[PDB]
Amino acid sequence: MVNPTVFFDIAVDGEPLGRVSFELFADKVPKTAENFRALSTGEKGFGYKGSCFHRIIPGFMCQGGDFTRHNGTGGKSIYGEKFEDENFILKHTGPGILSMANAGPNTNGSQFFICTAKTEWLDGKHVVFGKVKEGMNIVEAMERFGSRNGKTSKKITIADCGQLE
Amino acid sequence: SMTEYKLVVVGACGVGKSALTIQLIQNHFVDEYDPTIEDSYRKQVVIDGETCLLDILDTAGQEEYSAMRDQYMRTGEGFLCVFAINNTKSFEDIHHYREQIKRVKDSEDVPMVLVGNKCDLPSRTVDTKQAQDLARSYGIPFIETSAKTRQGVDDAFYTLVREIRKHKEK
Ligand SMILES: CCn1c(-c2cc(N3CCN(C4CC4)CC3)cnc2[C@H](C)OC)c2c3cc(ccc31)-c1csc(n1)C[C@H](NC(=O)[C@H]1[C@@H]3COC[C@@H]31)C(=O)N1CCC[C@H](N1)C(=O)OCC(C)(C)C2
Ligand SMILES: Nc1nc2c(ncn2[C@@H]2O[C@H](COP(=O)(O)OP(=O)(O)NP(=O)(O)O)[C@@H](O)[C@H]2O)c(=O)[nH]1
Ligand SMILES: [Mg+2]
């Protein structure tokens, strides 16, 4: 199976910052990659467009994907509110890794995080399913607006998103 | 100025540390689950006729980061040790928190209150007598709470302030 590529156009207080694109590892986690792909195109009628990165912790990660409650507690998958951990083949090996947020085993929805450092203690607990292809400097720039506990000092949004390949 | 008390709320994930703290500070119940990274709050209150400032650290229950707690345990003056009455694992976790506080502070006299939360829920699995006995063995108060109904919320935090006051004057 061929790995698709999706993009987010990131905005800061409504002003463009830049584009981040992601390779999705459909060749290892097809169901998890397909969820993120479909949420990025919006083709099911809902998805990431307009949602925010609610937690940015410099040195660690940027987390977003709550397009249902917009408060860090929500989100849903294309399969229902939650779906199972597909596998843990891929690991949190360094900056750029794209991985599923969760609230314990088998609670994947739509929330995700982009690592800005290696976060190996999450291995085997969070499903890694992609990596930044272009625009890692934009993810780095998003760290300008984070904090120790992740509260953001400006509103960081996915102004647009979709599929490139 | 009024005395400031550095209170720290600890316990396993999901027991209601944030719900209790937000009830105290903001007078509403958070029904959704927003697992905490680390949050701080401040409130002035009157306890036993003396106005004081509560500085409350609401900590994460995440088991993965137990080593990261030492820093805030050294800084904190008193600890609310919270479990959920419908979660026996959370009650067993209490011992590890108490021992960690005792180790990090190097003292048996650390101001502490044992809090059994979620007393509005019907599915009790931790006996009240179990919790009472544990608190007695530690020599600390035990308070039953519900962040949902607000039962015992003020009592838990105010009792902890009283324990700090007794400790500072002992
Ligand atoms: C102890 C402090 N502390 C740290 C931490 C730890 C460290 N280390 C640990 C590792 N050491 C190496 C071994 C030596 C170095 C020092 C340093 N400094 C810190 C921070 C900055 O000190 C404040 C963390 C951390 C994480 C949590 C709570 C406290 C935490 C936490 C709470 S909730 C969660 N984790 C999982 C969360 N779940 C939800 O959001 C559910 C919500 C509801 O249902 C859908 C949605 C989720 O999926 N993610 C997606 C994945 C990254 C993850 N969030 C997150 O934010 O991690 C933050 C962070 C910083 C990576 C880790
Ligand atoms: N019925 C009931 N539910 C409660 C009570 N306290 C908390 N809850 C619920 O339990 C869940 C977890 O509460 P929360 O305050 O986030 O717990 P926490 O101990 O802060 N968790 P963490 O360590 O991850 O930050 C929430 O859905 C909350 O509404 C209570 O007294 N009664
Ligand atoms: Mg909390």
Work out the number of other CB atoms within 10 angstroms of the CB of residue B140. 19
Strand A97-100 relative to strand A112-115, pairing: antiparallel
- Nearest Cα neighbor of A35 from A51, A49, A24, A50 is A24
Q: Which domains can be identified in chain B, with CATH numbers?
A: 3-169 (3.40.50.300)
Contact A103 B32 (CB under 8 A): no
d(CA B119, CA B102): 27
Q: Which domain holds residue A35?
A: 5-164
What is the whole-number distance in angstroms between the Cα of residue A133 and the centre of ligand 2? Answer: 38
| Residues A33 and A131 sit within 8 Å (Cβ to Cβ) | no
Experimental technique behind these coordinates: X-ray
d(CA B17, CA B49): 27
- Nearest Cα neighbor of A147 from A50, A63, A52 is A63
Resolution in A: 1.3
Alpha-carbon Rg for chain A in angstroms: 14
Look up residue B169 and give its amino acid: E
Residues of A with active-site annotation: 55, 60, 63, 102, 113, 122, 126
Q: Which CA distances in Å does B119 have to A114, B87, B92? A: 39, 11, 17
| Residues B100 and B130 sit within 8 Å (Cβ to Cβ) | no
Write the DSSP symbol of residue B3. Answer: E
d(CA A158, CA A12): 9
Write the DSSP symbol of residue A143. Answer: G
d(CA A122, CA A60): 11
Testing ligand 2's pocket by substitution, the residue of B18, B28, B153 carrying the most ligand atoms inside 8 A of its CB is B18
Atom of ligand 2 nearest to the CA of B34: 16
Structurally, how many domains does chain A consist of? 1
Q: What is the CATH number of the domain that holds A88?
A: 2.40.100.10
d(CA A92, CA A109): 19
- Return the axis-axis angle of helices B17-26 and B153-169, rounded to nearest 10°: 90
